[PDB]
Amino acid sequence: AKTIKITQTR
Amino acid sequence: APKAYGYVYTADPETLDYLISSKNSTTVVTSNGIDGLFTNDNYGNLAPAVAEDWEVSKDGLTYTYKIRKGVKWFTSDGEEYAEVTAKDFVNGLKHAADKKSEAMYLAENSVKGLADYLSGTSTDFSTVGVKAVDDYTLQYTLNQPEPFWNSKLTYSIFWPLNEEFETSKGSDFAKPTDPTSLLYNGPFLLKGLTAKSSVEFVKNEQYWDKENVHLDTINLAYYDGSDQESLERNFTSGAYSYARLYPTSSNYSKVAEEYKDNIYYTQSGSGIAGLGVNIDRQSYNYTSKTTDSEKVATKKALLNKDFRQALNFALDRSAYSAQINGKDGAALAVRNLFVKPDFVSAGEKTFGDLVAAQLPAYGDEWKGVNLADGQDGLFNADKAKAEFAKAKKALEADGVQFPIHLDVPVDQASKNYISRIQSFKQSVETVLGVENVVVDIQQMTSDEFLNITYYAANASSEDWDVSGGVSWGPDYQDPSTYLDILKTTSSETTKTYLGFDNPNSPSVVQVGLKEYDKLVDEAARETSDLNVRYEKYAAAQAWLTDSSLFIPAMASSGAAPVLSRIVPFTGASAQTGSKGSDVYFKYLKSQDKVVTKEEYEKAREKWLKEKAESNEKAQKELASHVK
User: Fold this and answer.
1) Of B45, B90, B478, B584, which cross-links B618 as Cys (Cβ 3.0–4.6 Å)?
2) Any S-S bridges, and between which cysteines (chain B)?
3) Among B482, B460, B461, which Cα is nearest to B471's?
4) Inter-chain contact B468–A5, Cβ cutoff 8 Å?
């Protein structure tokens, strides 16, 4: 799965 | 109320179609409403979901699932629509094939006949190895044994879809602002979607397993990173159930003292964050370069392995991590391999151990490399300069003029993404010299950034030289889930991490990725001996590490300071797939008071002891399913 790294909320 | 879960989401979904999307933003809005055959319990075991029982043939090629009876599809308003039956999984996989799912890599070579349906060589889906034997008996037939097959079933491409509903919605199906455009069979109903604002769920009060659902509502507020203090601020007000903390926040000393007894650190997650190298850049809408000579220079530099290794060795990962974690806890999150080093083990050797045994063939510089998480094994200024010296001589001999300019885009709303890329810039420039390499940070809006990274439509849209905007999480329990996606043919993912989508591109041949394909394919053919299969996948990871085509930096999640009102270790635990507690909130329990660090640490030590028990019990029980 692709995920965005701009915010690391966990 | 403790039963009102509140937190955040970071990107609006492009679609609600969970069968087609490979992006976490779709998982975030759908997993709580859509169950497949299995979920994960709080120890990480597969738990019966829509499948009440299962069996596998002696030769490992045929899996058969008994569908639990009385499981209903519901509208977003709680109207019963239809029974969930085996036909919904037949239709799910057919839809994934017809609409050309972004995640097809994990089914196309596994399910018998699917590759031929995908390409159109076979015209009838009845020739594909998924069958509704009857309404409550679902049978998959595979091309080879796959010990990790059942773990794929917690990923969304294997979720069911009611064909009647799908057809009735037509072109309005699964639209990303319309919760009425899906049906729900899971613990919650998706009730609201408002762009750049909120994602909303309510408890499915007719769910068969509602006894294990301990939240009445779920609300996710849009968070774009412009106000990182909002996470703790809304936790403390009681709005949020959880808060990831940023020790570089200007008010952090006050938070740390206030919650001294409550801040605890989570384990590093399984996904990889790092910087992809665009080996075939096409568009220059976001560049500081002004001449064609600069663009050719950068393109030749990125095809040079020594240049890429120079960037890889120049990155101070502790400093990078510290831009979101502060200096003290920065090391915890550092990662030196695309595949998490302990993702699998062969006997006593971790996957990282196997990679480290093979890497020194590529060069003495890899000798003694420490690939373990929690420490920077790759940062080495001397080796970075040595590698750049080799690259400088080769590139100067080809008429390249320095400095090499590298465009790195940033979402200008995410302050700590800018800070991370600023730390990459300072690393590369301080170690290699601005006379040699210049990192040009391209600031743009959130939507502009999404359209050249996360949601880029094609390789042409990958408007960057190096980018860390998109991570990768594993979809199932085998190294192929990390490594297959970088094969020259996996064009859905090669554009995102490597900037290309043409498998026969001259850039692709130049960097030797056809050799990587052969290593990956040779590992994939090992189904008899898991130890040998993992050794062979480690040969592919070894090539990838040496290639420096992706620069690993840190775990994409976890290894972070947090505050919580969630009862520790009540949530689903999942190393892979779409049923972990990051997106799926069954089992999870909430409490009144803030968890203390002592409460968390005690629960963790007790959980680790129970987990080893439960996991071994689960493994011993597998033989009971061979029929």
Assistant:
1) B45
2) none
3) B482
4) yes
DSSP-H helix ranges across B359-399:
381-396
3-state secondary structure of B55: strand
Q: Are B523 and B344 in contact (CB under 8 A)?
A: no
DSSP conformation letters of B531-562: HHHHHHHHHHHHHHHHHTSEEEEEESS-SSEE
C-beta of residue B39 within 8 angstroms of C-beta of residue B154: yes
Resolution at which this structure was determined, Å? 1.8
**CA–CA separation, B567 and B595 (whole Å):** 7
Experimental method: X-ray
Give residues with Cβ within 8 angstroms of B406, minimum separation 6: B298, B428, B437, B438, B439, B440, B465, B466
The two structure tokens encoding residue B464: 């960057």
Chain A residues in contact with B454 by the CB 8 A cut-off are: 2, 4
Per the listing, tokens 């960057």 go with B464
| Residue B94 contacts A, CB cutoff 8 Å | no
Measured in whole angstroms, the distance separating CA B435 from the mean position of its chain's CA atoms is 37
Q: What are the distances in angstroms from CA B21 to CA B15, B29, B192, B463, B513?
A: 7, 12, 20, 22, 26
CB-based contacts of B116, cutoff 8 Å, min separation 6? B122, B127
Domain boundary assignment for chain B: 272-555
Residue of A nearest to B497 (CA): A2
Cβ contact, residue pair B223, A7, below 8 Å: yes
With CB atoms and an 8 Å threshold, state whether B11 touches A5: no
Which tokens in the block code for residue B13? 């979904």
**B581 phi/psi in degrees, rounded to 5:** -70, -5
Per DSSP, the three-state class of B260 is coil
Instruction: Give the H/E segment covering residue A3.
Output: strand A2-4
Looking up tokens 């302050």, which residue turns up? B415
Beta bridge partners of B270: none
The residues, ordered by sequence, that sit 6+ positions from B309 with a Cβ below 8 Å of its Cβ are B383, B384, B387, B546, B548
The DSSP code sequence of B204-259 is: -TT-TTGGG---SEEEEEE--SS-TTHHHHHHHTTS-SEEE--TTSTTHHHHHHHT
Question: Residues near B410 by Cβ (< 8 Å), separated by ≥ 6?
Answer: A6, B417, B418, B421, B441, B442, B443, B444, B449
CA atoms of B10 and B454, how far apart (whole Å): 12
**CB under 8 Å to B141, separation ≥6 — which residues?**
B61, B62, B111, B112, B113, B129, B130, B131
For residues B300 and B277, what is the distance between their CA atoms, to the nearest angstrom?
12
B92 in contact with A, Cβ within 8 Å: no
| Residue B79 φ/ψ region, left for φ over 0, alpha for ψ in the -120 to 50 degree band, beta for the rest | beta
- The CATH-assigned architecture of domain B272-555 is Roll (3.10)
Strand, helix or coil at B54? strand
- Cα dihedral B471→B585→B321→B561 (10° resolution): 180
Six token digits for residue B183:
């049906």
Of B98, B22, B60, which Cα lies nearest the Cα of B484?
A: B22
